[PDB]
């Protein structure tokens, strides 16, 4: 459609400046597989957006998990033999694995050898994450914040 390629998967509707954070925060550039990227691409729906094109690769739950509280409006879709075979939404599980870090500095998750983990109580306002260890809850605007 918008200039596809045999197999692989396209991540469309990425919010501006979030695109590049994905390539890194997800070792996406870790391959010999032809990748195409578009930053600050114009869009008739979000104003401006990012877009990644990973040739001969896929997701499902491996990472479309994080994409949730990241690109709440992104659109991941598989492409086979030049054709979109499945548009997807943000499957945003209530559980998030180790790629994350608890803000409570006195949480034992920092000192000891254990993969982080949060429960995601998605209030319609902002997103809240409760730590599996210290049990304190926060806002994803703090956990994902610098």
């Amino acid at each position: 459609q918008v200039e596809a390629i045999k197999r692989g998967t396209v991540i469309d509707h990425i919010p501006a400046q979030i695109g590049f954070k994905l390539l890194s925060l997800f070792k996406l550039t870790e391959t010999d597989q032809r990748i195409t990227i578009g930053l600050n691409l114009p869009s008739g729906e979000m104003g401006r957006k990012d877009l990644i094109k990973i040739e001969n690769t896929f997701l499902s739950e491996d990472q479309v998990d994080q994409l949730a509280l990241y690109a709440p409006q992104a659109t991941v879709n598989r492409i086979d033999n030049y054709e979109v075979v499945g548009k997807s939404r943000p499957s945003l599980p209530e559980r998030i694995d180790n790629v994350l870090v608890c803000p409570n500095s006195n949480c034992i998750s920092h000192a000891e050898p254990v993969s982080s983990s949060f429960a995601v109580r998605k209030r319609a306002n902002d997103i809240a994450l409760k730590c599996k260890y210290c049990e304190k809850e926060f806002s994803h605007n703090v956990v994902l914040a610098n």
Binding site: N106, I108, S109, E112, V114, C131, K132, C134, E135, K136
Partner: peptide
């Protein structure tokens, strides 16, 4: 009884 919060939880693992 431990000084960090979550230490008990970690222990059970």
């Amino acid at each position: 009884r431990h000084p960090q919060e979550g230490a008990a939880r970690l222990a059970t693992e």
